[PDB]
Every structure is written in structure tokens, then in C-alpha cells.
Amino acid sequence: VLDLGALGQDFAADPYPTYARLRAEGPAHRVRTPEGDEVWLVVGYDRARAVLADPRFSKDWRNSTTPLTEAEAALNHNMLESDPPRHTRLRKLVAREFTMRRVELLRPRVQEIVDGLVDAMLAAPDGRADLMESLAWPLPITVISELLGVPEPDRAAFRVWTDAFVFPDDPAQAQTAMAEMSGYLSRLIDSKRGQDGEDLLSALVRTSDEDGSRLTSEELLGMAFILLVAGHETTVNLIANGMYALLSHPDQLAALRADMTLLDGAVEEMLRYEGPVESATYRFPVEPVDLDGTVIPAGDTVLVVLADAHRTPERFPDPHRFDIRRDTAGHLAFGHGIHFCIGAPLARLEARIAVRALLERCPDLALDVSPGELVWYPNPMIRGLKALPIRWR
Numbered sequence: 001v002l003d004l005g006a007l008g009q010d011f012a013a014d015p016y017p018t019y020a021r022l023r024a025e026g027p028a029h030r031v032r033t034p035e036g037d038e039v040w041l042v043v044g045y046d047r048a049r050a051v052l053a054d055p056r057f058s059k060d061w062r063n064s065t066t067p068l069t070e071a072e073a074a075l076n077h078n079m080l081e082s083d084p085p086r087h088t089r090l091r092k093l094v095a096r097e098f099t100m101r102r103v104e105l106l107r108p109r110v111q112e113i114v115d116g117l118v119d120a121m122l123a124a125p126d127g128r129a130d131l132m133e134s135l136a137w138p139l140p141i142t143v144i145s146e147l148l149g150v151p152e153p154d155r156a157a158f159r160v161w162t163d164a165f166v167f168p169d170d171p172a173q174a175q176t177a178m179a180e181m182s183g184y185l186s187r188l189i190d191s192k193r194g195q196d197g198e199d200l201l202s203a204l205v206r207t208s209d210e211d212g213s214r215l216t217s218e219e220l221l222g223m224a225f226i227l228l229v230a231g232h233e234t235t236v237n238l239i240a241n242g243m244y245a246l247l248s249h250p251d252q253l254a255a256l257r258a259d260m261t262l263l264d265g266a267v268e269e270m271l272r273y274e275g276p277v278e279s280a281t282y283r284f285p286v287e288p289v290d291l292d293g294t295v296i297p298a299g300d301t302v303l304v305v306l307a308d309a310h311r312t313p314e315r316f317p318d319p320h321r322f323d324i325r326r327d328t329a330g331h332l333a334f335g336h337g338i339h340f341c342i343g344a345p346l347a348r349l350e351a352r353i354a355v356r357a358l359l360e361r362c363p364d365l366a367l368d369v370s371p372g373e374l375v376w377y378p379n380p381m382i383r384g385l386k387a388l389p390i391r392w393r
């Protein structure tokens with residue numbers, strides 16, 4: 001059992017050599033997370049993509065031998081932690097809200113949010129700012145809160161709970177945040193009842209109240225929860241990891257500046273090169289699964305290392321090169337299979353507008369620290385920075 005916690009911040013800042021060393025030995029490996037959990041790692045692009053869509057690897061915790069606390073189980077009835085037919089039923093309820101054509105209707109508002117955030121950032125007299133606090137945090141939480149009807153005075157506490165899910169000071173802090181967020185979301189759901197709101201949460205409340213078999217009260221809470229959480233840390237870190245990739249590769253930043261039509265491909269390579277999802281969410285084999293002689297027993301926890309899949313040289317030649325013109329087709333930053341990210345059009349819209357605004361409105365935009373001075377969070381599932389100091393003229 002490889003102890004990942006004994007590797008320190010070096011593994012948090014640069015986990016790729018560790019994953020690559022494992023991939024040379026095999027596709028499946030028993031590890032111990034820095035937090036102390038014994039899980040399986042699936043490495044290698046071909047194996048990673050296959051396991052993500054393999055129905056033998058369930059996402060329902062009824063198939064897991066890991067126990068859930070009361071706070072964890074209260075938020076567990078969501079589409080990401082379900083199999084068919086429950087997953088099919090839950091995703092159908094909101095699939096129309098997140099299509100490309102429906103998300104495109106949010107472009108004027110997303111552009112307005114980015115414009116105002118860049119306005120306040122450019123007001124700095126020294127021309128310096130933390131891109132995390134100035135743009136990477138507020139943009140996604142503002143977009144998803146307006147969509148789901150989360151009032152502004154409640155959004156600050158929502159980020160604190162999210163922070164406790166990724167980098168808790170102690171395991172009890174993560175449990176308290178889950179219990180507090182569940183209590184808040186239930187109160188928020190109750191506040192929509194009978195108010196004739198037209199936000200997404202108001203519509204879900206009416207759907208659940210009209211037919212509890214189509215959306216139970218537990219699944220109503222789980223739906224609000226997963227829609228608000230699954231896209232927060234990921235979108236925040238895509239903007240930050242992507243801008244870090246651009247600013248730490250000046251040749252690519254200048255190429256994008258000279259030809260802004262490469263914007264969409266650059267964002268795709270940001271997902272490929274430094275995607276926010278280091279490893280996919282929990283998967284449990286319903287039966288023993290043989291992966292090239294390595295048998296993963298039923299009920300064990302399996303983490304698909306998307307970060308290693310994106311550095312497999314047979315799939316992405318010269319994998320450690322950040323190339324905004326690279327053929328990025330087939331990356332797993334949004335997953336693969338029935339659980340493929342429902343928010344991918346919205347995430348791409350937010351990232352594309354944010355990156356374009358920073359390049360067009362920050363003359364001589366630059367990383368205000370050395371790459372070695374940046375600090376990465378030690379979470380096996382999320383790849384994200386503590387801060388992104390930047391400067392401009």
C-alpha cells in the first residue's frame with residue numbers, strides 16, 4: 001500500500017511523476033490518501049476512460065463497504081452518487097436546463113458578472129491582485145446562485161462549507177460543514193414553497209411537491225446540493241489552473257493574444273493540461289473486477305486518476321507540453337459515460353469569457369510570483385491553488 005501522505009506537498013504540487021511510476025507497473029494500485037483512506041487508483045488513459053463508463057463500477061453507496069456518517073447520507077441522494085434507473089430519472093429532471101442553447105442564453109449575464117469583477121480588480125492602485133479572490137471565486141458562485149436562487153447574503157457561508165470539503169482543518173470540520181449545509185439547503189427549499197419563484201430550485205420544489213415519487217424530499221435536497229457543489233470548486237480551479245498555465249507558458253499566452261480565435265482550444269487544453277478534477281468521484285465494483293491480473297474486490301473504493309490519463313503519452317503526445325493548438329479531443333476532464341458533466345457548457349462559457357476578459361483588459365498580465373512559490377491544496381480529487389498572485393500595467 002503506497003502511502004501518499006508521506007510524500008508531502010511535493011505530491012500535492014506535482015503528483016504526475018508518482019502516478020506515472022504507478023502506471024508503468026499496472027493500471028490498479030492500492031494507496032492510502034493523505035487523509036488516511038485506503039482506496040484504489042486507476043491510472044492510464046485507456047483504463048481510466050473504460051472504468052468511467054463501466055457499469056461494473058457502481059456509484060451507489062449501497063454497493064460500497066465504506067460506512068457513511070449521518071451528515072454524509074443526508075446529501076447522498078443525488079445523480080452523481082446513483083446508478084440507473086435512479087440516475088436516469090434524476091438527470092432527466094434538469095437536463096434541459098444545461099444544454100448548450102439554454103446556457104447560451106446566460107451569456108449576457110455571465111459577461112456582465114465578469115465585467116464587474118474585472119472592473120473592481122483593475123481598481124487596484126498597485127496593479128496587483130489575487131486572481132482567486134478577485135475572479136476565480138466570485139464568478140462561479142454568482143452564476144450558480146442566481147440560477148438556483150441562492151440569496152446573496154447566504155453565499156459567503158456557502159464558500160466556507162465548500163472550503164471545508166476540500167481542505168478541512170480536521171475531519172470534524174468537514175462533517176460540521178456537511179451538516180450545516182444540509183440544514184441550510186432544507187431551510188432554503190422550505191423558503192421557496194408557495195412563493196411562485198421561477199428559479200431552478202423553485203421549479204424543483206414544485207416538481208417534488210406535485211409528485212414525491214418523481215423527486216423525493218431527500219432527492220430534492222440532494223439535487224440542490226449536487227448542482228451547487230459539483231460545479232463550484234471545479235469551475236473556480238479551471239479558471240485559476242488555466243490562467244496559471246497561460247501565465248507560466250509565455251509563448252502560449254502571446255500566441256493566444258495574437259490570435260484570440262484560439263480561445264476555445266486554449267480552454268480545452270487547460271482542461272487537458274491542468275484540469276481541476278485530479279481523480280474522479282467514488283466508484284464501487286458490484287463484483288470482483290480483474291484489471292490485468294489485479295483483482296479489485298467488491299465494495300472497495302476506486303478513484304480514476306484523470307490527471308494521469310491526461311499525461312499518458314500514447315494518447316497525448318508530448319503530454320507535459322502546454323499547447324493551446326493541441327488536439328484535445330477525448331480528454332476526461334468532464335468525465336465519460338452516463339455521469340458526464342451536465343454543467344460542461346456552462347463551465348466552458350464561464351471559463352471562455354473569464355479568460356478573454358483577463359487577456360483583453362490586463363495589459364502585460366503576468367504571474368506575480370514564481371511557480372515554485374505557489375502552493376497547491378493536498379486533496380487527491382481536486383487540483384487547485386491556494387492563491388494566484390497576478391499583476392498588470
Ligand code: HEM
Nearest residue numbers: 079080230231234235238280281333334335339341343347
Ligand atoms: C471546470 C468545470 C467542471 C469540471 C472540470 C467538471 C467535471 C465533472 C466530472 C469529471 C464529472 C463526473 C465525475 C465522475 O464521474 O466521478 C462531473 C459531473 C457532474 N457535474 Fe461537473 N464539472 C465542471 C462544472 C460543473 C458545473 C458548473 C456544474 C453545475 C451546474 C456541474 C455539475 C455536475 C453534475 C450535476 C455532475 C453529475 C452528473 C451525473 O452524474 O450525471 N459541473 N463534472
Ligand SMILES: CC[C@H]1OC(=O)[C@H](C)[C@@H](O[C@H]2O[C@@H](C)C[C@@H](N(C)C)[C@@H]2O)[C@@H](C)C[C@H](C)C(=O)/C=C/[C@H]1C
Nearest residue numbers: 072165166174229230231233234277281379381382
Ligand atoms: C464534479 C464532481 C465534484 O465532486 C463532488 O462534488 C464530490 C462528490 C464531493 O465528494 C465528497 O465530499 C465529501 C465532503 C464527502 C464525500 N463522501 C464520501 C461522504 C463526498 O463524496 C466533493 C464535495 C468533495 C471534493 C473535495 C470536491 O470538492 C470536488 C468536487 C468535484 C470533483
